[PDB]
Design a protein around this nucleic acid. Structure first.
Ligand SMILES: O=P(O)(O)O[C@H]1[C@@H](OP(=O)(O)O)[C@@H](OP(=O)(O)O)[C@@H](OP(=O)(O)O)[C@@H](OP(=O)(O)O)[C@H]1OP(=O)(O)O
Lengths: 223, 48, 102, 836, 278, 442
RNA sequence: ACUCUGGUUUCUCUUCAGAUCGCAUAAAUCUUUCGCCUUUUACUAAAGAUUUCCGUGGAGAGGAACAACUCUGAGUC
């Protein structure tokens, strides 16, 4: 790769791609050797595929390296960012407290050899927020039941897709609670121009069988 | 009050240093008065 | 606690609704470093007199290190002059206290 | 104003002098007073001083001078004509004093400054010792005399006693530093000038005597100064200097006739406007206008003192009396600075300072232009006259007669020798005068000698510049983005030329490391780099201290390496150096160039080393100054003595390479007595491969260091923290937190302050001054300069517990983690291999 | 006009005596080590705020310097931290201990320690060796290493040559007052100057500018920090473009025939204004 | 093993350009010497007993003692030292010979497919097109002629120009080994000399970069010397006798127009414009496609460039309030004709490029005769062939460039793109929006 | 010791702002982001650019008031 593309100024890591969602200590170790290997592999892949039939742009790609320098691997998966960390490399006070990780073992060793910490992808969270914005957008004359059912479908879909990632990702919880309050305020302003001082939650959670909106929510509101 | 009641002076309401807030209120009033003058002129005119 | 305080400090370094008055959540003076947390008050060797601090209380609150050193270093004539000055000051203080609550 | 250029021709009317200061404020105030006296156009504002010596904006904003300013003018004298004084004002910081070291070669006379209230300081003592070791004249100046008069309000007799104590301490320090008979300094001798540098109040005994003669009578000023200077007492009945002190209640002559009038004038001025009444002014022979009286107390006092005390004639007279002309003073400078010896014909001609002889100018200072694109090399012209456009060969600091390629020819544009107005009207400058050569900046980095192209073919550059301080604080430099990496590198080069103390090294790990002495020094370096030399934003690393590797125990087993050519093997054993030898060798006490008999006598007398051991081939690190010495103890019974003589150069090169790059962290190694046990090698020259010895030699060095007990060494910085008495104990508390040890603590004589000399490790020294000043709530002040290497606790290669990434390690574990981190950061293999 | 005042030294002495209660005893600017306006400026120009300094909203998002990725040299595996790099270190040397300092301000390094002794008793002479001043070695030093003059052989001085300033008291009663005023705060250091308005003389200003009112509850700290924030924000944006024509609108209204001038008590004017507002 | 001489010559350990000897085997240049310095350490570590000198390029005969090169491996020495005299330039001008490089590639004198920076590749293409002229290579190879002009110490333009010329001569020299040449040194010199304008950090406009380079070249050769007419400037100077008329503003009525004419406002005034490179603007873009709704390409005939004799002389338009009549008339046509299409133009909101085809045949032209009929005697060689044409491609934001140049005399007419080295046929070359064209009078 | 030297308080009027206009400190609008977010009054909080607003200095002009007392430098004094 250096023969094909020299790197005398060490500018390879100048425009590297990394996942900003993960914390600093685990996102990506942009060591010179790891960056050089990533660029070399990307160049090899781009050379093995003709630029006419298809293409692999670097500006919209992702590479992860695991070695003596970088101890983690990053996968984007099916719209879910998951980092794998072997147990044999670092301990860092290993414990079984949260459910946001996955215990993976070997067939022969029959012991937990690596843990996969997963979270909703930034693209997936943005798409869900855009869907919520679309639902709140078509509220000029739509029925309240239609709006609340659209929210129920959206929240149910997201939870059924990645419950573990929803629980793990604090940002996902914050954004879902924020847009849930957005829709609740939309219903309130639909009821009256002003804002209720108390806004009782019986209306928003009584099932439609009993005559209510029946909004399924992932929040925690104490009646 | 913290300083006034620093020592032998009681911890009661007996503090008399109004100048410190008086100057701040004077400055804020000086900033505000253009708005009041402009609106009062708008009312005093015929294009209210 | 101090060791853990330094630990998370280094980790952090590297890794409408009307309100009546200010809130204590904005305080920044909380520093775990005992040297920075407990800063030696600048008494100016018996010459430090803060404005709002009571003069008599400040004299009582003074560490008296400078006063004790001056008393030790003062000669017999200097000690006599200081004793006379403090006696006159005490007489003046008695004169003022006589007027108060008379 | 053409007399400024006219006086430059007279080689006997020049007074090459460099200034020193406890703090840059005091010296620059004096320089500004001198400029105001010489230049009537520039007048200091009432709010703040002009500070004409602070050219850089960084110094102006920070308040501490950054770069030395070589600016002065023709100044008159009381009993003499105007002499073209040229003064290189130096910064008043412990680290920045390294820049003043350059001035040590600019001039042959140091007009040292000492604050009256502050007294002796660590910076002042270090500067005095360095000047004494530099063989230059010293004329002391009691600075801030108004502090004792006004700030302390001390009695006149007590003030005189304090001044005498300060002078006595200075004289004792000078006598300890140098044994020359000219060490006597006193107002009677003319080596002490009382110059407050504030309110323009400067004088000597001769100045006061001349003022007395001008006021009334016709008393000989020289005799009066010789009499009234000391404590000889004055008898009014006898009306003469009576050493027996006849009068019971009389005051000393200096106190009665010199200090007392100044005290009376200050009391009248500061006390009240009615105290400094027009009657008092008339009694003093001054008639100030109503406008001058309406000014505030400080401007009124400044005007009164300036009008009453002349125009600093006493300082000029004192400098002329002792600081020699360049013609007289060139011979000692030729003997000291020149490495070619004064016995050389060109050297002998330079010792005579012949303008019409060969051209030999030594440029050591480097100054950036206003645009910052180009530089200008400032230096003294020892011999010859430089002309605009005349080509010259600029031999660098590393130039030698072995290779002529080390020097390059370049043209010299405008000279701009005059600096007071910073103008470039100078066309040619004679010998002995400072010249700011333009256009020759590119071939030379720093401390390089320019010479005529074809007139001389054997003249060599002067000795390389040496500094008392040692750069121990290292910091990495990287660009924010590599896209414009070379641009930053350009600025880096501009840093290397501008600051002689700063050392830019391209480490093997692809990191550009800047080595400096103090934290403020490196901060100023980075500010100049970002703002001026390279506008690119630069990312840095946490400051690190250069570490040393030492030995405590002798090597257990011998270590031998075989040359590839027919297996020629050299075996050696390393032993720790004798206690106290490291600083002795490092102080240039003994050089490898010394005669074998002289070195043997020195070692047998001082350190009681064996005569056979002394007669062995001695290396003593790089440039004979490295504390790690090498002795070739090979047995003469072996037939390798001829081979050793034929391989002595290769062995020395291998030893110096190993000294520069050790086995642990590849850093400098000191206090290692490498004993070359033996060597078996084929006598055939073909088997004596030059490249097969130095790698083998350094491998032997590494194995011997591993065979011996290895230890890490950190540079303990001396800090003379001055603080008020109440905080003194609290100051120790700071040293308690930063692993500091208090060496001494004494009250300041005549001042309520209190000095504490402490030895702070460099690892914890980063930000120590900030902690001391903030904890003491802005009262205590500190100043830290590197003092000596001290062995760090623990073992570099012992298998110890790995420390947490963000937690300080325990004391026994410091050495191993220091070693591993340094090895990894340098780019070499982290793990230390015993086999390697 | 009452615009400029020319006064005497004793009046400053007595006014400073009276105002000692409202004025702090600090005389050297080194006390405001990291509390001068430049320290707060360079703190605001960064995310980090000193413990004694107020917090600030960052000027920009600054996501580039928020959480940088691990690099070859930026890795904490190699950086050794003997002591925490506190905000004091960054503020003291912004160009060294701060990656990408960018737009910052420069702080004053040091000021020589003001060695001053405040007068304790007026009767005692000013030029007196105060006990706090450290004693000096009054060594006999019978040796004569210093040069010595002739013994009753030269230096014949005329009797008309007096030691210059004579028949004048070296120490006077006003010396102590003046030398104390010479190290007064800003208002009293000036012998004579120009007036300032009543509303723009901040008495409390010197209070919060101090390091801290030590021994105070948390709420006092919070109030001091917030008011220091307000003061530093006031100090930041301070540039008048107002090259006015000095059109005194109030004077023109006074000259208007629709209004007249008179003299009356302040309380009468106050009740007049209350009635007018009603 | 690696030829890194394309990058800037600097120390690998000392960061100094003085006495920077290069490792003959390792390939790293350090400022140290053979004994007790950085180069000594490199020799004792890399085991490379030979190291080429900084200036003489003398490989170390001994590991540390002496530095004397061997003529056996003088290929790198000849590559780093372009020394083709005029007699050798004639051989260089005889490009028909198969000038295989050291590695076996194609030399392509002036049209070598050297590597270009990722950004501002238009500047690299412009430099290559300028270097594609054998006169440019001959001028660059004349180091003695180049060194004749004194270089002022204050200005760094002369040094950057000299470095760029040396790099171009090395690229055009047959002694080169690798077809791809790193423009890092050239890009840095261009950025430093041009005050960061047209820097390699971001994509730069071809016309602006070419104008800046021409101005810098003129400044390098021109100045205080008696030869004010710089060789680079005089090669492509030109002269337009534009009888500019300050015609009245359109808002002025007929009476105001008559008053201005009586006041000689609309009088023609000769401009004597330098016109270093002709700037021919394409006509208006087709707002609505009529023939084929998918895309309408209004090809501009080459006579539009030749229309500057009268069409430019009939221009009565300006962006100011007064409708200035340009009345452009090119008097003296330079031997080198550099036509700039200037397809990019800023609209009221965004800058857009006209996709109109060039439609410019590569044959003889008669615009010089049309511009001035009497000048035909002076301009005997009016048959100018388009030597090198560079066309932009892609979107205006994320776009690139591609050029095709013909060797003088040989007439290869090959594409200068590194991948498509040999492309003689036009292959609808005029179909794309040619960014610029360069032709020689011949 | 000799000749000329000649006001400062003030009131307004008209300009120009250098100078921390001011050793104090507000407000309005607009602009970009941050909390945004429920529409404007608004905000939160910083940056950027204006404006008003409290004030001030320089300089010039015109009357009143001490205009006759000169201050003061020059005038070899
Ligand atoms: O409501 P906060 O701002 O917290 O302060 C109030 C109160 O202040 P106001 O008078 O402004 O309502 C009192 O203050 P003063 O009466 O002194 O002015 C009182 O103080 P005292 O008890 O000293 O009278 C007391 O403060 P604290 O009890 O802490 O001294 C109390 O604060 P809390 O509401 O927090 O009790």
């Amino acid at each position: 790769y250096l023969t094909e593309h020299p790197d005398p100024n060490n500018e390879n890591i100048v425009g590297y791609n990394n996942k900003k969602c993960w914390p600093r200590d685990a996102r990506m170790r942009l060591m010179k050797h790891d960056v050089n290997l990533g660029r070399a592999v990307f160049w090899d892949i781009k050379n093995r595929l003709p630029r006419s039939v298809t293409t692999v742009q670097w500006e919209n790609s992702f590479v992860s390296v695991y070695s003596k320098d970088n101890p983690n691997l990053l996968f984007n998966m099916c719209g879910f960012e998951c980092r794998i960390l072997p147990k044999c490399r670092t301990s860092y006070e290993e414990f079984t407290h949260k459910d946001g990780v996955w215990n993976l073992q070997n067939e022969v060793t029959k012991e937990r050899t690596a843990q996969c910490f997963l979270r909703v992808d930034d693209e997936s969270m943005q798409r869900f927020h855009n869907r919520v914005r679309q639902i709140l957008m078509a509220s000029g004359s739509t029925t309240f039941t239609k709006i609340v059912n659209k929210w129920n479908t959206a929240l149910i879909g997201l939870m059924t897709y990645f419950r573990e990632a929803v629980v793990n990702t604090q940002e996902l919880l914050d954004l879902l609670v924020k847009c849930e309050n957005k829709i609740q305020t939309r219903i309130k302003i639909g009821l009256n121009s002003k804002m209720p001082s108390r806004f009782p939650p019986v209306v928003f959670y009584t099932p439609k069988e009993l005559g209510g909106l029946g909004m399924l929510s992932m929040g925690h509101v104490l009646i | 009050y913290y300083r006034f009641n620093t020592g032998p002076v009681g911890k009661g309401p007996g503090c008399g240093f109004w100048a410190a807030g008086w100057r701040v209120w004077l400055f804020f009033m000086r900033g505000i008065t253009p708005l009041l003058e402009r609106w009062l002129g708008n009312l005093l005119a015929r294009q209210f | 606690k101090d060791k853990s305080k330094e630990l998370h400090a280094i980790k952090e370094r590297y890794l409408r609704k009307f309100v009546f008055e200010w809130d204590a959540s904005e305080d920044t003076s909380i520093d775990y470093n005992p040297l920075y947390k407990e800063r030696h008050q600048v008494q100016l060797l018996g010459r430090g007199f803060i404005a709002g601090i009571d003069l008599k209380q400040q004299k009582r609150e003074q560490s008296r290190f400078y006063g004790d050193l001056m008393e030790k270093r003062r000669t017999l004539e200097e000690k006599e002059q200081e004793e006379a000055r403090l006696r006159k000051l005490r007489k003046k203080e008695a004169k003022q206290r006589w007027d108060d609550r008379h | 104003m053409d007399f400024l250029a006219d006086l430059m021709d007279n080689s006997e009317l020049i007074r090459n002098v460099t200034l020193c200061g406890h703090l840059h404020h005091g010296k620059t105030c004096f320089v500004d007073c001198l400029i105001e006296q010489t230049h009537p156009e520039i007048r200091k504002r009432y709010d703040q001083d002009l500070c004409y010596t602070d050219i850089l904006f960084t110094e102006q904003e920070r308040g501490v001078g950054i770069k030395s300013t070589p600016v002065t003018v023709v100044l008159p004298d009381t009993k003499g004509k105007s002499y073209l004084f040229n003064i290189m004002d130096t910064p008043g910081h412990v680290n920045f004093s390294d820049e003043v070291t350059a001035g040590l070669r600019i001039s042959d006379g140091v007009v040292l400054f000492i604050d009256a209230a502050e007294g002796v300081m660590l910076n002042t003592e270090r500067l005095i010792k360095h000047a004494v070791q530099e063989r230059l004249a010293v004329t002391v100046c009691i600075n801030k005399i108004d502090r004792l008069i006004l700030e302390l309000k001390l009695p006149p007799t007590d003030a005189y006693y304090k001044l005498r104590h300060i002078v006595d301490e200075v004289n004792g320090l000078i006598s300890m530093y140098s044994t020359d008979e000219n060490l006597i300094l006193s107002p009677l001798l003319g080596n002490v000038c009382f110059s407050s540098s504030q309110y323009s109040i400067c004088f000597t005994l001769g100045s006061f005597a001349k003022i007395y003669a001008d006021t009334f009578g016709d008393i000989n000023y020289q005799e009066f100064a010789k009499r009234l200077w000391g404590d000889i007492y004055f008898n009014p009945k006898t009306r003469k200097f009576t050493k027996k002190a006849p009068t019971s209640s009389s005051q000393r002559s200096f106190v009665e006739f010199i200090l007392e009038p100044l005290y009376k004038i200050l009391a009248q001025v500061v006390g009240d406007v009615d105290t400094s009444l027009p009657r008092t002014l008339d009694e003093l022979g001054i008639h100030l206008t109503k406008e001058e009286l309406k000014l505030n107390i400080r401007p009124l006092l400044r005007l009164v003192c300036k009008k009453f005390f002349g125009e600093f004639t006493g300082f000029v007279d004192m400098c002329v009396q002792h600081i020699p002309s360049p013609k007289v003073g060139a011979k000692p400078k030729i003997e000291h600075t020149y490495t070619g010896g004064v016995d050389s014909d060109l050297g002998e001609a330079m010792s005579d300072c012949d303008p019409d002889g060969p051209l030999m100018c030594h440029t050591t200072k480097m100054y950036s232009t206003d645009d910052g694109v180009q530089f200008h090399a400032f230096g003294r012209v020892l011999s010859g006259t430089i002309h605009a456009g005349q080509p010259v060969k600029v031999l660098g600091e590393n130039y030698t007669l072995e290779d002529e390629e080390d020097s390059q020819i370049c043209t010299v544009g405008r000279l701009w020798i005059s600096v007071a107005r910073y103008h470039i009207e100078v066309n040619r400058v004679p010998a002995g005068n400072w010249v700011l050569i333009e256009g020759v900046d590119q071939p030379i980095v720093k401390t390089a000698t320019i010479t005529e192209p074809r007139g001389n073919e054997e003249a060599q550059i002067f000795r390389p510049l040496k500094f008392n301080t040692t750069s121990v604080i290292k910091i990495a430099v990287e660009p924010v983005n590599p896209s414009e990496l070379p641009k930053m590198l350009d600025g880096l080069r501009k840093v290397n030329k501008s600051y002689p103390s700063l050392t830019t090294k391209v480490e093997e790990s692809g990191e550009h490391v800047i080595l400096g002495t103090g934290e403020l020094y490196l901060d100023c370096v980075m500010h100049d780099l970002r703002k001026m030399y390279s506008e690119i934003d630069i990312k840095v690393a946490d400051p690190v201290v250069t570490f040393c590797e030492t030995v405590v125990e002798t090597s257990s087993l011998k270590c031998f390496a075989e040359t590839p050519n027919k297996k020629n093997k050299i075996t050696m054993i390393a032993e720790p150096l004798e206690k106290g030898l490291a600083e002795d060798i490092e102080n240039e006490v003994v050089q490898i160039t010394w005669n074998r008999k002289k070195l043997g006598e020195f070692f047998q007398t001082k350190y009681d080393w064996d005569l056979l051991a002394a007669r062995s081939i001695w290396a003593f690190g790089p440039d004979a100054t490295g504390p790690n010495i090498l002795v070739d103890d090979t047995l003469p019974s072996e037939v390798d003595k001829a081979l050793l003589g034929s391989v002595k150069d290769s062995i020395v090169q291998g030893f110096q390479w190993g000294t520069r790059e050790g086995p642990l962290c590849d850093e400098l190694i000191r206090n290692v007595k490498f004993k070359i046990l033996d060597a078996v090698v084929a006598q055939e020259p073909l088997h004596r491969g030059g490249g097969q010895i130095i790698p083998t030699a350094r491998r032997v060095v590494y194995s011997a260091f591993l065979m011996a007990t290895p230890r890490l060494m950190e540079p303990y910085y001396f800090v003379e923290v001055q603080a008020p008495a109440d905080c003194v104990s609290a100051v120790y508390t700071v040293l308690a937190r930063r692993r500091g040890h208090v060496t001494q603590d004494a009250p300041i004589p005549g001042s309520p302050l209190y000095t504490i000399k402490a030895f702070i490790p460099a690892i914890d020294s980063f930000g120590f001054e900030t902690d001391l000043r903030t904890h003491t709530q802005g009262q205590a002040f500190s100043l830290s300069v590197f003092h000596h290497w001290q062995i760090v606790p623990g073992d570099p290669l012992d298998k110890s517990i790995v420390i947490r990434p963000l937690e300080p390690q325990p004391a026994p574990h410091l050495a191993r983690e220091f070693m591993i981190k340094t090895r990894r950061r340098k780019g070499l293999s982290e793990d230390v291999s015993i086999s390697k | 006009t009452y615009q400029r005042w020319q006064f005497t030294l004793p009046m400053m002495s007595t006014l400073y005596r009276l105002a000692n209660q409202l004025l702090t005893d600090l005389v050297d600017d080194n006390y405001f080590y990291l509390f001068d306006l430049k320290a707060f400026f360079t703190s605001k120009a960064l995310n980090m705020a000193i413990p004694g300094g107020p917090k600030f909203e960052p000027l920009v998002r600054d996501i580039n310097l928020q959480d940088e990725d691990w690099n070859e040299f930026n890795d904490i595996n190699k950086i050794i931290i003997r002591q925490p790099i506190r905000t004091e270190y960054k503020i003291a040397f912004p160009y060294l201990y701060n990656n990408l300092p960018h737009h910052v301000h420069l702080t004053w390094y040091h000021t020589p320690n003001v060695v001053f002794i405040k007068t304790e008793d007026p009767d005692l002479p000013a030029f007196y060796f105060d006990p706090l001043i450290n004693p000096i070695s009054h060594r006999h030093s019978v040796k004569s290493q210093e040069p010595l003059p002739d013994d009753d052989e030269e230096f014949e001085l005329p009797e008309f040559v007096e030691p210059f300033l004579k028949d004048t008291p070296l120490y006077t009663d006003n010396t102590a007052n003046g030398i104390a005023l010479l190290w007064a705060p800003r208002p009293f250091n000036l012998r004579s100057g120009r007036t300032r308005r009543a509303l723009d003389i901040p008495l409390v200003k010197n209070w919060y500018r101090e390091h801290c009112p030590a021994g105070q509850p948390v709420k006092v700290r919070v109030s001091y920090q917030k008011l220091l924030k307000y003061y530093v924000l006031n100090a930041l944006k301070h540039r008048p473009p107002k090259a006015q024509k000095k059109r005194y609108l109030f004077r023109s209204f006074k000259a208007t025939k629709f209004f007249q001038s008179t003299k009356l008590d302040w309380v009468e004017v106050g009740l007049q204004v209350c009635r007018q507002g009603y | 093993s690696v030829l890194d001489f394309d990058f800037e010559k600097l120390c690998s350990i000392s960061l100094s350009h003085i006495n920077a000897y290069a490792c003959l085997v390792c390939g790293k240049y350090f400022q140290g010497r053979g004994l007790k310095s950085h180069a000594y350490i490199h020799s004792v570590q890399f085991s490379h007993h030979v190291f080429l000198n900084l200036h003489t390029l003398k490989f170390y005969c001994l590991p540390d003692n002496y530095e004397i090169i061997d003529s056996s491996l003088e290929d790198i020495t000849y590559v780093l030292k372009p020394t083709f005299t005029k007699q050798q330039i004639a051989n260089l001008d005889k490009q028909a010979k198969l000038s295989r490089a050291y590695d076996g590639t194609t030399y392509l004198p002036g049209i070598v497919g050297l590597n270009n920076i990722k950004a501002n590749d238009y500047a690299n293409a412009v430099l290559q097109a300028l270097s594609n002229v054998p006169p440019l290579r001959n001028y660059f190879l004349e180091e003695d002629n180049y060194k004749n002009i004194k270089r002022p110490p204050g200005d760094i333009m002369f040094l950057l120009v000299q470095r760029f010329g040396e790099l171009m001569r090395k690229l055009w020299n047959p002694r080169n080994f690798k077809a791809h040449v790193s423009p890092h040194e050239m890009l840095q010199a261009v950025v430093l000399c041009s005050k960061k304008t047209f820097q390699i950090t971001k994509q730069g406009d071809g016309v602006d970069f070419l104008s800046w380079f021409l101005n810098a070249l003129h400044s390098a050769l021109g100045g205080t010397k008696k030869k004010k007419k710089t060789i680079v400037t005089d090669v492509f100077q030109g002269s337009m006798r534009i009888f500019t008329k300050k015609l009245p503003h359109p808002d002025l009525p007929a009476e105001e127009k008559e008053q201005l004419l009586h006041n000689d406002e609309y009088q023609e005034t000769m401009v004597e414009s330098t016109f270093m490179y002709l700037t021919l603007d394409l006509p208006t873009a087709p707002l609505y496609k009529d023939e084929k709704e998918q895309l309408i390409i209004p090809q501009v005939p080459l006579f539009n460039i030749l229309a500057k004799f009268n069409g430019i002389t009939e221009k009565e338009y300006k962006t100011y309030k007064e409708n200035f009549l340009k009345r452009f008339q090119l008097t003296k046509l330079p031997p080198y004709l550099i036509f700039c299409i200037k397809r990019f133009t800023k609209n009221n909101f965004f800058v857009e490029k006209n996709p109109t085809i060039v439609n410019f045949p590569i044959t003889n032209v008669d615009l010089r005769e049309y511009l001035s009929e009497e000048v035909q005697a002076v301009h005997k060689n009016t048959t100018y062939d388009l030597i090198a044409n560079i066309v932009h491609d892609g979107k205006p934001s994320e776009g690139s460039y591609r050029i095709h140049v013909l060797h003088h005399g040989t007439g290869k007419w090959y594409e200068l793109q590194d991948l498509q080295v040999t492309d003689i046929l036009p292959q609808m070359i005029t179909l794309s929006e040619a960014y610029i064209q360069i032709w020689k009078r011949r």
